[PDB]
Design a protein around this nucleic acid. Structure first.
Ligand SMILES: [Mg+2]
Ligand SMILES: [Mg+2]
Ligand SMILES: [Mg+2]
Ligand SMILES: [Mg+2]
Ligand SMILES: [Mg+2]
Ligand SMILES: [Mg+2]
Ligand SMILES: [Mg+2]
Ligand SMILES: [Mg+2]
Ligand SMILES: [Mg+2]
Ligand SMILES: [Mg+2]
Ligand SMILES: [Mg+2]
Ligand SMILES: [Mg+2]
Ligand SMILES: [Mg+2]
Ligand SMILES: [Mg+2]
Ligand SMILES: [Mg+2]
Ligand SMILES: [Mg+2]
Ligand SMILES: [Mg+2]
Ligand SMILES: [Mg+2]
Ligand SMILES: [Mg+2]
Ligand SMILES: [Mg+2]
Ligand SMILES: [Mg+2]
Ligand SMILES: [Mg+2]
Ligand SMILES: [Mg+2]
Ligand SMILES: [Mg+2]
Lengths: 147, 104, 128, 52, 187
RNA sequence: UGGAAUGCGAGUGCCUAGUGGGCCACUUUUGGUAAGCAGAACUGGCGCUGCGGGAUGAACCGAACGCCGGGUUAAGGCGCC
RNA sequence: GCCGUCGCUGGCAGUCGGCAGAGCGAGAAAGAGAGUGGCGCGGACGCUACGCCGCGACGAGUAGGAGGGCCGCUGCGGUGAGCCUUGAAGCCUAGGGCGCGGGCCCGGGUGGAGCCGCCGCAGGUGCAGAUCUUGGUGGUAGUAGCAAAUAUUCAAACGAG
């Protein structure tokens, strides 16, 4: 909406909001990211620190799907199965343990951050973390691996 | 092309337009800078301050029961002074009634 | 037989003349409509002595008598007969002004209605 | 000139990009062409599966 | 003339909500009435929060409302919020709660009602307890927005853990000079 | 008995234009014989600012401005203009 | 005295009426509270609450910023049972007025067919300058000038000349 913009109140003022002494010239600093090392060093150091230089090893033909591994935390682990599986395992008495298959939900690694409810589980996953496995033993449960 | 080189003329007034404010004095100042070995022993002191808790209550509740045998052992002119009492909305209610009845 | 207002207060106006534009006299391209002069060396916007004046907000009219014609009535543009009943409960404080386009055949049956309704019309002999 | 704080963004607009602009104003006029030829095909192959 | 300074004459508080919806502009009418006609500094805070923008009244989580209503003493009270009550899927038990908020997500209405709690509105609250007696005012985390991580001391400055604005984060995105003690320096 | 006086609501967070040629004055002050010169310090101004006075006037004295009625002043004045 | 801004994060839903009882300005934290025993059918205004009302203090301003425009231009969706050959747009006007203003409304004239008010939507939307662009017109001015190469005169004819 031009009728809402700022150039509708700027009709009649000579410099059009841009200065009488210092005009609105075209490129009074160079174009783009120019002068990153010479006259814009205070800004490229106060706001983009580490922007200049090399570090580390290159990797030519990187393919972003060999290193695919989406993780799910223990806090929302019990959210992968329905509710009538966690409460069915609550009401359960024969000690049966529901099998939570994670790679079926779309995660490979299981990280252990949250608390767990006191009931057994059988977590099928591709990769496990040490703490994610200890929080499962400490509640009683098995960490199955699936290639 | 000689230009003015340096001045401080308006500076003492720009400084005061937004005031010169002393820093924010908070209680519990940070412990950065203190010497390592001392702050390592202060951390070992905090890490074990709980170790003497069940012995700390045994004394706090002790001196708090003793607080019982502590405390339960001890346990300008007449004119404008009478007018400043008649003219009290609550304290003067009856000196005022004694006057209201006065005209009957 | 004038249709008097409810109350006719005293109307006082802090200024009567228009606010002419700077240098609207030396030139013909500069109309009399006001334009705030924004030039650097201008003598009018520095409020020099004896120069043209500027429309401050101080010149505002008394709110009690603002928009009030010299007949003690405010006004209302009337485009047809139906727009009078809107004004028939404001009779003694507002007046009617039949539009410029309403032909005389309608303006006659508009002044007729406002006559029955005792509403005052500012241009009742307009077209005929 | 950069402002106070922001991104170092590289716009890829240093070629004559206004010449090679591709507008999709014929997208609704080609969805109907595809659907029309898809039912001309589903009428050319009479009982054979429409998907192929 | 007087030698005062008008730098701060215009207090910048919100006199009214910026939204134009009429189910909020009626709540604000009822609560502006309660605010001026009662001597309870509760209604005044509810009104002052009904003005606030969508970024100043953030969402609440069901779990944070659990742990803020489990604090000893405040039992059988109504948890008032001015923002929205989002769900918190990482909590398994839900008690019964009397609640009053502007929004309750369609997967937290389920949990709360299956638990057995009530979900009032601000008009229901204003009719239940006008002066707001028996209530618990809450408000979600304000520094939760990712925006507050770029604010503070600018990056590239001794001990300023402020997040920079970068297109992407990776090996070769601002990791070379003002970060390595090797290449140049670090802060 | 909130531990001197007087005064006054404060604290905090983002986003941000314009600016980055200055000049004058009291006092101190460096180069220069000096300059309506070059260069600094403190405060106030002009710039960005009208008004009464100084005949006139960027900077001097008084005094800072919404539009009006009455009254009284500042600095300057009161043979005539 | 009037206009406006700021502040009081001020006051007003109590217009609670023969189902009535008309109050919360007053120096002093809190009820014109309940129960428990010793004729005449009457009463202004208000309140688009984005509204209305009351109090004080304040009012300069370039560069710059922000807000409010029932200021203005052109088209779009709605809406004015809108206006108009009994005269629309446009233009002119020693006529009447409104608004601090941007601007606007009436009257008279000319004109001859379309045009506007409101709520939203959109923008190639407001000019005094840019040695601006195109077109039109002035003072200069009935002025400069109509001066290189010797030279014209008389009578007659045609012809309004
Ligand atoms: Mg300006
Ligand atoms: Mg310019
Ligand atoms: Mg600007
Ligand atoms: Mg610049
Ligand atoms: Mg530019
Ligand atoms: Mg260099
Ligand atoms: Mg810049
Ligand atoms: Mg003043
Ligand atoms: Mg300089
Ligand atoms: Mg410059
Ligand atoms: Mg010089
Ligand atoms: Mg000098
Ligand atoms: Mg100037
Ligand atoms: Mg200048
Ligand atoms: Mg100034
Ligand atoms: Mg001055
Ligand atoms: Mg002199
Ligand atoms: Mg001003
Ligand atoms: Mg004329
Ligand atoms: Mg004609
Ligand atoms: Mg166009
Ligand atoms: Mg022009
Ligand atoms: Mg001649
Ligand atoms: Mg010749």
């Amino acid at each position: 909406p031009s009728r809402l913009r700022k150039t509708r109140k700027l009709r009649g003022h000579v410099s059009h909001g841009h200065g009488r002494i210092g005009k609105h010239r075209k490129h009074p600093g160079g174009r783009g990211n120019a002068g990153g090392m010479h006259h814009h060093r205070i800004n490229f150091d106060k706001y983009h620190p580490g922007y200049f230089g090399k570090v580390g090893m290159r990797h030519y033909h990187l393919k972003r799907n060999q290193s695919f591994c989406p993780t799910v935390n223990l806090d929302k682990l019990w959210t992968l199965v329905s509710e009538q599986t966690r409460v069915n395992a609550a009401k359960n008495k024969t000690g049966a343990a529901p099998i939570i298959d994670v790679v079926r939900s779309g995660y490979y690694k299981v990280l252990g951050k949250g608390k767990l409810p006191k009931q057994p589980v059988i977590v099928k996953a591709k990769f496990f973390s040490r703490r994610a496995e200890e929080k499962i033993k400490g509640v009683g449960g098995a960490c199955v691996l699936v290639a | 092309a000689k230009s003015k080189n340096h001045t401080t003329h308006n500076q003492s007034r720009k400084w005061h337009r937004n005031g010169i404010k002393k820093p924010r004095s908070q209680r519990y100042e940070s412990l950065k800078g203190v010497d390592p070995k001392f702050l390592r022993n202060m951390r070992f002191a905090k890490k074990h301050n709980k170790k003497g808790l069940k012995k700390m209550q045994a004394n706090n509740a002790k001196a708090m029961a003793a607080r019982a045998e502590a405390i339960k052992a001890l346990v300008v002119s007449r004119k404008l002074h009478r007018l400043a009492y008649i003219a009290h909305p609550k304290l003067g209610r009856r000196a005022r009634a004694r006057i209201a009845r006065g005209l009957r | 037989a004038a249709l008097r207002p409810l109350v006719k207060p005293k109307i006082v106006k802090k200024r009567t003349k228009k606010f002419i534009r700077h240098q609207s006299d030396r030139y013909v391209k500069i109309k009399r409509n006001w334009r705030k002069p924004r030039g650097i060396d201008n003598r009018v916007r520095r409020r020099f002595k004896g120069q043209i004046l500027m429309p401050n907000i101080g010149y505002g009219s008394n709110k009690k008598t603002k928009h009030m014609l010299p007949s003690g009535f405010r006004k209302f543009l009337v485009h047809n007969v139906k727009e009078l009943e809107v004004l028939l409960m404001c009779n003694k404080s507002y007046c009617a002004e039949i539009a410029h386009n309403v032909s005389s055949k309608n303006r006659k049956a508009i002044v007729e209605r406002a006559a029955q309704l005792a509403i005052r019309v500012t241009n009742p002999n307009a077209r005929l | 000139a950069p402002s106070r704080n922001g991104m170092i963004l590289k716009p890829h607009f240093h070629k004559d990009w206004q010449r090679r602009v591709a507008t999709w104003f014929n997208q609704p006029a080609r969805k109907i062409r595809r659907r029309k030829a898809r039912q001309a095909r589903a009428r050319r192959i009479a009982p054979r599966p429409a998907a192929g | 003339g007087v030698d005062i300074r008008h730098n701060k004459d215009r207090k910048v508080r919100r006199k009214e909500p910026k939204s134009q919806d009429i189910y909020l502009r009626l709540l604000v009418k009822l609560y502006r009435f309660l605010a001026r006609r009662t001597n309870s500094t509760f209604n005044q805070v509810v009104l002052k929060r009904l003005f606030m923008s969508r970024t100043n009244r953030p969402p609440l989580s069901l779990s944070r409302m659990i742990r803020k209503m489990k604090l000893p003493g405040r039992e059988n009270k109504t948890a008032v919020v001015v923002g929205t009550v989002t769900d918190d899927v990482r909590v398994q038990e839900v008690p019964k709660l009397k609640v009053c908020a502007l929004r309750v997500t369609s997967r937290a209405r389920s949990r709360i009602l299956k638990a057995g709690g009530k979900i009032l509105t601000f008009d229901q609250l204003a009719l239940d307890s006008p002066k707001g007696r028996g209530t618990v005012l809450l408000s979600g985390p304000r520094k939760g927005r990712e925006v507050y991580r770029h604010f503070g001391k600018a990056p590239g400055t001794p001990h300023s853990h402020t997040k920079p604005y970068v297109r992407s984060k990776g090996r070769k995105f601002e990791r070379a000079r003002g970060r390595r003690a090797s290449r140049g320096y670090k802060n």
